[PDB]
Design a protein around this ligand. Structure first.
Ligand SMILES: Nc1ncnc2c1ncn2[C@@H]1O[C@H](COP(=O)(O)OP(=O)(O)OP(=O)(O)O)[C@@H](O)[C@H]1O
Ligand SMILES: Nc1ncnc2c1ncn2[C@@H]1O[C@H](COP(=O)(O)OP(=O)(O)OP(=O)(O)O)[C@@H](O)[C@H]1O
Lengths: 191, 597, 295, 634, 108, 108
């Protein structure tokens, strides 16, 4: 019945969105800005107990990562593994979130130079607390995100030129690209 | 199983009522002139056919054509090979659950609908007899696909000793049937609370297709089976009707029986038709004798000349009714709608007058621009009815100028430019500038600027408000008899059966009398109207010198000749006479004076 | 419950309430109470040519196994009857219960002193088209009376429910008097064969217990000039328990009033249970009748 | 397990053995009556909602649906002893749940809320139609038996497997075609209705999957509220956003009620209960056979307005109405009665129109600006990419028996007035702009609250000088109720003492005791309060049809026509064939409230002495002479 | 028939993808008018957007268009025949004979 | 589907390589023969079709001998064979409500 989180706040230095490249991976960097175009409230998973119905589907598996639709590690008996999964709704706690876009403040914009932006996932009790339309600060953990090219119906720029190196994993040959995004933990709105 | 077959080949060669031997006496009559079709009749078919339908209700979708294989085997008995298969047409009538009980107990049972058909698609083809080749092993077979569960009743297998799916569809020895996907619409009267109507889809067979035009009352009887298109949640399918037989009402292409026309000729010799209709057309209208005669001539019309040159005359008349509120110009117009063969009713606000005649839009398949919609193309041969000719100034006048007077439109939108035919007949009922002031001032102020529409219509009534103390009290005596008591519904039913004509008899003889005779006026009348006009123009000519302007021009003079041709369609005489034509001007001479006062 | 094998378990709903008019109501409880026993099956359009023709034998059995357990408990024995039937080989089964019903209505409709002649020439003529109804040669005229009959009851019940709710039946002392002064559709009361049926419906509204004053009524109606007023009397009825000799008392009194003054009274109609009266004579009619106790 | 078998036994007695409120067997009444219509519905009474909830709330939120599946099979055997043989007739019942204590809306849905009972509102946007659902999957093997029984399929999850209990091979499970019953399935997507919402922002979207006997109850455009559960079934495939550990919500509904109004209640008017059987119907007869009712009722309608009589009488007549009566193959007859209020800026004309909106069953309140000519009646909303030009209604086709407003939108007067005076004249109007040529049905009622340019007596000159409307659109109405006051001492206190006392009108026993306080506070003079008064109106409009006589009708023909003569020889605006059709109609509206189907003599003179004075008093200075005329009419 | 949708002398870039990879400037109304005659009605009962098109095709024999594709000068030899009506009834004699329709004098 | 009559086994191929030898295949294109292919839709002569419908249409595949002969707007009169092609009902599975019998005219 107990689920927690870690909420730091009030680091000294506050940056802008144009200063986030190299040292900022796995760091903690407070970021200002203004917010526009929220979205709705859907649930996430972080842990399941799905398993195949081969003999017994009561294996609480691990690793609910960004492609988590395959619990296939350490089956219970000597049975058939990775043959199925049944994501029950009855035993795995969820946590609720929303995806929002931010934007740079008006007292810093050098010229009218198509002011760039990025996106951010907020996942704890931070839900529905960023009212859209205020000068807002954030927690700071930076994160990269892929697309694993799941079993769905699909699998200008030279994008993914980096990703041509990312070929030849043990699953199928493709190009897994990347994009810098943001995970938060704690909001504030001074203003 | 089989053997059902033996229960019916030993059943339709002997069913009869008392010594008429009917089904051989019509199948013999139906193999001769090529139709290849049946019907069924009454109760014992029902009496033991339920005892067959208690083994046919389980699947009336595969053993309905187990009837069909039988009657071919009785057909060759009446021949002695070119023999097609047949089709079935049914009949049943108890009531009409309109569109309510449609998923629970009505999958694959016999249903009866009442609807208004609106939209026809172009024809297509599916096969019924094929020939099949294995590829590298060259087997030859033939499969027949008769009735359906839309496509894929059975498939083609893998067995020929050649490779997998080696089968191909030649086109050398094949037959074909056509389907429709015409759309059905609910009759807009049966379920009012606050809702909007819905719609279904259906197909048919060739010897019952192309039997409906859009804009009619219809009834239909058939199955409620289910297909599944893969172009939305769980695996859900859609509904459609497989129809069997349209025992419709009339077409509302001039073939019918003979006893209908026997009474018509027996009525048309009694020369009281012109006065007896004016009482019998509108059983709910106090008098209004000048207006009432204008409607019966409007419904039938004149003719059409394609005379040996290039041009043509326009054989039609178009009336107007303008006057004070409370003079029954409105509710008279619903009355012409049911009695017409083809009628629409778009009477309000123009309804986007550019999109009255034509519409084009993008397409879900192939992204194309083709022609779909119109108010006029639906309404050919008949009569439209609109109103409010004061507060439409946008496009209503620029849309009817071409649509009238030549009746030949061509859309020049992004796709085609085609001159589609039109033979329409219009009707309108507007308001003047609040009525009384247009009858208490200078006689102008009717249309805001232009009179050019008014020259395009010939007949104009201008009603008014009197105060005659004896004609109102009769009217106040009239409408309480027709409101409650419904005693005149018992009175007019009592003078019906020997003297008057109901509504369903008027409709059927108008389409007969129009589509048979072709009048022409006599050259003795040529001296009559010529002597008439020269003082009519002079009566106008004496008025202009008194600084009185406005409108009469020569369309009306070629409109009176259509008016005198109209009652010649009524009497069905191939000439026109002088007691014919003197009563005709007596309608229009009356409407010349009110054009001045 | 009649004409079922010909048709309409729909318009049975009216004359099922006729049967509940034989019980304790005319509209109120039944328009709830009928909806235990009837809309159990929605009544179709195509297979209703087969279900209330054929597999209503599963349901006639079911009423046969409904009313056997409505027998020691309800005990209302106006429904089960032995009856008689005939067939033609084909063309449906037609019994004789409904068959007399078509002959009555088809005799009705199917068409100084100047109006009575053109009224009397009608009833002889429309009689004549019923006499030839006994061949096989009349088929598509046989159903004409059938579809005529199942509106005439709907016509006659339309006004019977009116004169109840008007509450103009007055038990004065002996009988009850009702004068239908004016309603709608007065034309269907010139020919007297409808009037005994209207009484036949009206004698059964008062066929409750009524353990005193079992006396039938006398009605009144007028359509034509000079107040012809084809007044008539009925018979009292028994709820299936004739022990007492109750034929009629009125014809004895009908000799009396006709013998008094001859001031425009008429007995020209054939059956003695119907006479005529003048408008100013019907009020001294009853005053002569409320004292002349001849039962 | 097996202890739930006792649970079904334990609740069954806990239901039917008790009836609250002095007995009279309430729960036994709901069951037998919705047997008699055969319509598959039950309820939960409010006062023993909570006592049926208290020992069952921990068995609500723990499992809301499997408790219901075992809740359903006891209701078969509940009625089976009462009505037998509900097996050959559709063999199926499922329960419903009444109102629930919960306020919240779409903004507040957490992970703690799921798999539980939820109540939420919104507006129904664009919907689909009705399809059949399989619901009983007969599975088909190829080699072994192709009949695996009609299954219990889920919602939109597409439950299947590879191989079980026949073999272990890849012979796929297929279909065949016999004895699989079908229910229906109608997916309405839902937008949040922009009422109780912190404004200036966007709507939010959800999904509703209806069930079998809950099809097409709502219409595309009203506001509703649902009492569903919160099932979150999806595989984890989504394509507007990328693939993620994310789940989507689906609200499977359990019941549905309509537009609610005046959300202030505590123990009543939360459900349209509307069941009038043993106690209510016995009562409704004896309230109808009294000799002063229509004098008492119209005094009892507007509770808080001390005004003159006739406006209450007409607005009593408007929502009662006559008959859309049938006719043969000829013209139909208007079955609606439409009134018009002329007033002064400062009397209470804006409130009686407000008050009737609650007391009617259905309504709409299109007022002021924005009333576009296409916007009231039907419009054609354009298609999305693979769609077609469909037909979406506006105001009137929703409001079958309601209210609009046209006072004086002076600029937009010429825009839409050519669309409402053909709703009465050409009654049942629809149109064909750029689409299909159909015609819907709308037997709507119009009231209006027009406003003269300045004061009420802007002139001694007549009504065509006073209002800016012209004649024909004005002539569709029945009566121009007009107000007036200059100076009156005793009449003013009769308002002034009246209005100040209204501002003085600012736990099972206590829930009852507040109600008697709520009952006494309306009962200062006890004018038959609104707890029962609206409830018999709804079947005073859907169960009784009046008819007429002949011998008393022709006495008013000269009373019409000689008044037609004096009004034509002396007239501002004329009466026509129109007005007399309203004369007989507002007569029979009164006798419709005697619940009696007949027309008397006591009403026609009452109906006349409403119209004639209310016509003549609007004329001029020359009105004192006409009052010497009308007592001859009386 | 002089119904004046944009298409009286142009293409409006209607290609219909011409089997996945072919874009065609489909001929509206000038491939029929070449070395022939046309006739159109109701000049004053038209919008503005046709009048700018009849300006170009009269001063110049050709139209040239680049809507979402190719500039192309295709040739045309046309000859219009006109039909319009005066505005204010029979007002021609009591006023100026000119401006009597008052459509732009670019065409007159 | 151009021989107009015989439904032969098709060759689902564009160009072969490496016949049964070790020689790299070369192709002579001057001695390879070609032909053209043009579809055109024909409306209805909108005077003799009676007034109950819009004009319908079908299509026709012709060959080189009378291409560029058909200006849009010509009273044409063609004659050819009536012909169906295409697999209706098997080339996809379950095939519900999809016609697979296209009307064609391979004419002269
Ligand atoms: N001459 C007449 N004979 C019989 N009935 C009439 C006549 N004139 C009007 N009525 C009656 O008027 C009733 C209602 O018509 P209504 O008042 O809608 O006319 P209206 O549409 O107002 O007239 P207008 O079209 O001039 O505005 C109808 O039931 C019709 O029977
Ligand atoms: N006779 C009355 N009894 C009780 N309250 C009244 C009375 N007359 C006016 N009021 C009060 O005056 C307030 C002002 O609203 P009012 O009814 O005057 O608007 P109105 O002038 O009718 O508006 P509109 O002119 O737009 O219809 C109302 O809230 C109402 O409570």
């Amino acid at each position: 019945e107990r689920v927690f989180q870690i909420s730091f706040f009030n680091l000294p230095t506050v940056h802008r969105i144009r200063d986030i490249r190299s040292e900022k991976i796995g760091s903690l960097l407070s970021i200002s800005g203004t917010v526009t175009r929220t979205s709705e409230v859907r649930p996430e998973l972080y842990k399941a107990s799905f398993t195949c119905d081969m003999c017994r589907a009561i294996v609480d598996n691990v690793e609910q990562s960004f492609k988590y639709t395959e619990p296939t590690f350490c089956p219970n008996p000597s049975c058939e593994n990775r043959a199925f999964w049944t994501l029950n709704v009855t035993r795995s706690r969820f946590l609720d979130w929303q995806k929002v876009r931010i934007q740079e403040n008006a007292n810093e914009i050098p010229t009218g130079s198509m002011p760039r932006t990025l996106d951010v996932i907020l996942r704890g009790d931070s839900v529905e607390r960023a009212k859209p339309g205020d000068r807002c600060k954030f927690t700071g953990v930076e994160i990269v995100v892929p697309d694993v090219t799941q079993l769905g119906l699909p699998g200008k720029t030279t994008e993914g030129l980096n990703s041509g190196v990312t070929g030849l994993r043990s699953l199928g040959v493709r190009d897994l690209t990347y994009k810098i995004s943001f995970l938060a933990c704690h909001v504030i709105s001074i203003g | 199983n089989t053997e059902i077959i033996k229960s019916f080949k030993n059943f339709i060669l002997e069913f009869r009522l008392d010594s008429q031997f009917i089904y051989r006496d019509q199948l013999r009559n139906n193999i001769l002139v090529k139709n290849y079709s049946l019907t069924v009749n009454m109760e014992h078919l029902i009496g033991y056919n339920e005892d067959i339908y208690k083994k046919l209700s389980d699947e009336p979708s595969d053993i309905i054509p187990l009837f069909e294989t039988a009657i071919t085997q009785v057909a060759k008995r009446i021949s002695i090979n070119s023999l097609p298969t047949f089709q079935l047409i049914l009949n049943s009538n108890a009531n009409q659950i309109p569109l309510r009980d449609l998923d629970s107990e009505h999958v694959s049972k016999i249903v009866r609908l009442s609807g208004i058909i609106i939209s026809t698609s172009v024809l297509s083809s599916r096969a019924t007899y094929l020939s099949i080749m294995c590829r590298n092993c060259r087997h030859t077979t033939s499969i027949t696909i008769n009735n359906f569960n839309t496509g894929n009743t059975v498939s083609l297998p893998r067995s020929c000793n050649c490779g997998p799916d080696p089968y191909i569809i030649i086109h050398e020895s094949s037959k074909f049937i056509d389907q429709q996907f015409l759309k059905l619409q609910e009759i807009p009267e049966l379920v009012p609370v606050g809702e909007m109507p819905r719609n279904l889809t259906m197909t048919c067979d060739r010897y019952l297709t192309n039997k409906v035009i859009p804009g009619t009352r219809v009834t239909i009887v058939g199955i409620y089976s289910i297909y599944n298109s893969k172009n939305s949640g769980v695996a859900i399918r859609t509904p459609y009707i497989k129809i069997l037989g349209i025992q419709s009402d009339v077409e509302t292409v001039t073939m019918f029986t003979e006893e209908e026309e026997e009474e018509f000729l027996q009525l048309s010799r009694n020369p009281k038709l012109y006065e007896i209709l004016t009482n019998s057309i509108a059983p709910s209208i106090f008098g209004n004798e000048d207006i009432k005669k204008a409607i019966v001539c409007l419904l039938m019309g004149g003719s059409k000349k394609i005379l040996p040159d290039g041009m043509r005359l326009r054989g039609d008349i178009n009336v107007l009714l303008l006057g004070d509120p409370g003079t029954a110009k409105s509710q008279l117009l619903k009355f012409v709608e049911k009695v017409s063969p083809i009628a629409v009713y778009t009477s309000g606000k123009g309804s986007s007058a550019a999109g009255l005649t034509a519409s084009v839009q993008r397409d879900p398949m192939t992204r194309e621009f083709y022609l779909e919609g119109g108010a006029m193309v639906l309404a050919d041969g008949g009569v439209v009815c609109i109103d409010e000719f004061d507060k439409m100034r946008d496009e209503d006048r620029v849309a009817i100028h071409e649509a009238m007077e030549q009746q030949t439109i061509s859309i020049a939108k992004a796709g085609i430019t085609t001159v589609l035919n039109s033979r329409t007949s219009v009707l309108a009922a507007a308001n003047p500038i609040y009525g009384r002031y247009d009858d208490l001032k200078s006689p102008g102020d009717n249309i805001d600027f232009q009179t050019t529409i008014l020259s395009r219509f010939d007949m104009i009534f201008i009603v008014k408000d009197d105060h005659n103390e004896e004609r109102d009290i009769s009217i106040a005596n009239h409408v309480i008899n027709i409101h409650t008591g419904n005693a005149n519904a018992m009175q007019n039913q009592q003078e019906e059966n020997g003297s008057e004509i109901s509504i369903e008899k008027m409709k059927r003889y108008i389409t007969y009398c129009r589509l048979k005779c072709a009048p022409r006026l006599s050259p003795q009348a040529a001296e009559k109207l010529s002597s008439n006009f020269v003082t009519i123009r002079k009566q106008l000519l004496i008025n202009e010198l008194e600084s009185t302007e406005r409108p009469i021009t020569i369309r009306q003079l070629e409109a009176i000749i259509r008016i005198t041709e109209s009652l010649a369609k009524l009497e069905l005489s191939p000439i026109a006479q002088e007691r014919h034509v003197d009563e005709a001007i007596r309608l229009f001479q009356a409407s010349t004076m009110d054009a001045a006062s | 419950l009649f004409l079922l094998r010909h048709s309409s378990l729909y318009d049975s709903f009216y004359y099922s309430n006729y049967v509940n008019a034989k019980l304790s109501l005319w509209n109120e409880n039944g328009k709830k109470r009928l909806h235990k026993m009837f809309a159990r099956m929605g009544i179709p359009l195509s297979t209703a040519q087969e279900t209330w023709l054929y597999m209503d034998h599963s349901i006639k059995r079911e009423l046969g196994i409904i009313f056997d357990k409505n027998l020691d408990r309800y005990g209302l024995q106006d429904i089960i009857r032995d009856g008689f039937v005939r067939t033609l080989g084909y063309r449906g089964s037609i019994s004789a219960s409904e068959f007399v019903e078509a002959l009555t209505a088809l005799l009705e409709v199917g068409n100084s002193a100047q109006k009575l002649t053109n009224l009397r020439k009608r009833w002889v003529s429309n009689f004549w088209l019923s006499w030839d109804a006994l061949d096989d040669r009349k088929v598509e005229l046989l159903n004409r009376g059938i579809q005529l009959a199942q509106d005439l009851q709907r016509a006659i019940f339309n006004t019977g429910v009116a004169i109840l709710e008007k509450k103009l039946i007055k038990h004065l002392r002996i009988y009850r008097l009702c004068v239908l002064q004016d309603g709608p559709d007065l034309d269907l009361y010139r020919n007297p064969l409808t009037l005994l049926r209207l009484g036949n419906w009206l004698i059964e509204c008062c066929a409750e217990s009524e353990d005193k004053q079992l006396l039938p009524m006398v009605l009144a109606s007028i359509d034509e000039n000079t107040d012809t007023y084809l007044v008539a009397g009925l018979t009292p009825r028994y709820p299936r328990g004739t022990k007492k000799p109750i034929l009629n008392n009125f014809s004895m009194a009908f000799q009396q009033i006709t013998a008094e003054t001859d001031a425009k009274v008429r007995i020209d109609n054939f059956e003695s249970s119907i006479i005529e009266i003048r408008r100013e004579d019907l009020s001294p009619f009853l005053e002569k009748l409320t004292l002349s106790g001849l039962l | 397990p097996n202890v739930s078998r006792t649970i079904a036994r334990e609740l069954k007695s806990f239901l039917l053995e008790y009836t609250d409120e002095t007995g009279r067997s309430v729960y036994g009444a709901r069951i037998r009556t919705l047997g008699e219509m055969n319509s598959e519905s039950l309820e939960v009474n409010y006062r023993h909602l909570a006592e049926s909830k208290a020992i069952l709330a921990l068995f609500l939120a723990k499992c809301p649906e499997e408790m219901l599946k075992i809740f359903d099979l006891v209701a078969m055997e509940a009625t089976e002893l009462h009505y037998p043989d509900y097996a050959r007739i559709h063999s199926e019942i499922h329960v419903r749940i009444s109102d629930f204590p919960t306020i919240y809306s779409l903004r507040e849905l957490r992970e703690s809320n799921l798999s539980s009972l939820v109540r939420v509102t919104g507006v129904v946007t664009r919907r689909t139609g009705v399809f059949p659902q399989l619901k009983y999957v007969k599975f088909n093997c190829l080699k072994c038996g192709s009949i695996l029984g009609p299954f219990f399929q889920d919602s939109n999850e597409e439950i299947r497997i590879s191989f079980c209990t026949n073999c272990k091979s890849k012979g796929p499970f297929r279909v065949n075609g016999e004895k699989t019953v079908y229910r229906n399935y109608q997916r309405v997507t839902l937008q949040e209705a922009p009422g109780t919402v912190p404004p200036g922002r966007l709507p939010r979207h959800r999904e509703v999957i209806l069930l079998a006997d809950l099809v097409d109850v709502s219409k595309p455009g009203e506001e509703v509220e649902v009492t569903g559960i919160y099932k979150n079934n999806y595989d984890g495939n989504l394509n507007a956003k990328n693939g993620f550990p994310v789940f989507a919500t689906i609200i499977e509904a359990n019941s549905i009620k309509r537009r609610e109004g005046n959300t202030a209640n505590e123990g009543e008017e939360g459900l349209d209960v509307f069941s009038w059987t043993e106690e209510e119907e016995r009562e409704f007869r004896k309230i109808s056979r009294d000799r002063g009712i229509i004098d008492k009722i119209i005094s009892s309608m507007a509770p808080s307005i001390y005004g003159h009589r006739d406006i209450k009488t007409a607005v009593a007549c408007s929502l009662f109405g006559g008959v859309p009566k049938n006719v043969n193959g000829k013209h139909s007859i208007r079955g609606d009665i439409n009134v018009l209020l002329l007033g002064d800026p400062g009397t209470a004309k804006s409130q009686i129109l407000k008050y009737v909106e609650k007391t009617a069953h259905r309504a709409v309140f299109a007022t002021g600006q924005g009333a576009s000519a296409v916007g009231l009646t039907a419009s054609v909303r354009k298609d999305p990419i693979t769609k077609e030009w469909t037909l979406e209604g506006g105001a009137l086709v929703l409001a079958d028996k309601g209210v609009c407003l046209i006072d004086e939108f002076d600029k937009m007067n010429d825009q839409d007035r050519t669309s409402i005076h053909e709703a009465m004249e050409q009654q049942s109007i629809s149109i064909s702009k750029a689409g299909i040529v159909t015609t819907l049905q709308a037997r709507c009622s119009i009231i209006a609250a027009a406003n003269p340019n300045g004061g009420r007596y802007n002139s001694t000159l007549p009504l065509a000088q006073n209002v800016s409307l012209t004649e024909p659109i004005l002539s569709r109405f029945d009566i121009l109720c007009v107000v007036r006051d200059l100076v009156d001492e005793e009449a003013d206190e009769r308002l002034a003492t009246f209005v100040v006392d209204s501002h003085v009108r600012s736990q099972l026993n206590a829930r009852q005791r507040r109600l008697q306080r709520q009952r006494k506070k309306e009962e200062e003079i006890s004018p038959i309060p609104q707890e029962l008064l609206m409830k018999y109106i709804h079947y005073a409009r859907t169960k009784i049809y009046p008819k007429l006589h002949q011998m008393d009708m022709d006495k008013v023909s000269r009373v019409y026509a000689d008044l037609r003569r004096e009004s034509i020889s002396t007239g501002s605006f004329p009466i026509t064939v129109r007005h007399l059709e309203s004369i007989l109609r507002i007569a029979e509206s009164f006798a419709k409230m005697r619940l009696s189907e007949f027309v008397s003599s006591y009403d026609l003179d009452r109906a006349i002495k409403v119209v004639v004075d209310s016509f003549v008093d609007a004329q001029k200075v020359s009105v004192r002479r006409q009052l010497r005329r009308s007592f001859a009419i009386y | 028939t002089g119904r004046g949708s944009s298409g009286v002398g142009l293409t409006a870039a209607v290609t219909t993808d011409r089997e996945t990879g072919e874009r065609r400037l489909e001929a509206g109304a000038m491939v029929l008018a070449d070395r022939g005659v046309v006739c159109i009605d109701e000049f004053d009962k038209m919008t503005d957007v046709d009048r700018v098109a009849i300006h170009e095709v009269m001063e110049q024999q050709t139209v040239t268009i680049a809507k979402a594709g190719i500039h192309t000068t295709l040739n045309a030899r046309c000859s219009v025949i006109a039909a319009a009506n005066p505005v204010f009834g029979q007002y021609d004699v009591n006023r100026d004979p000119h401006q009597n329709i008052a459509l732009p004098d670019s065409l007159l | 589907a151009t021989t107009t009559l015989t439904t032969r086994i098709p060759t689902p191929a564009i160009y072969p390589t490496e016949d049964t030898e070790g020689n790299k295949l070369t192709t002579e294109y001057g001695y390879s023969t070609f032909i053209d292919h043009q579809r055109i839709t024909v409306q209805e002569m909108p005077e003799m079709a009676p007034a109950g419908q819009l004009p319908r249409s079908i299509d026709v595949i012709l060959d080189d001998d009378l291409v560029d002969k058909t200006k849009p707007g010509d009273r044409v009169n063609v004659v050819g064979v009536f012909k169906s092609l295409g697999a209706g009902g098997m080339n996809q599975s379950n095939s519900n409500t999809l016609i697979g019998f296209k009307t064609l005219i391979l004419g002269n």
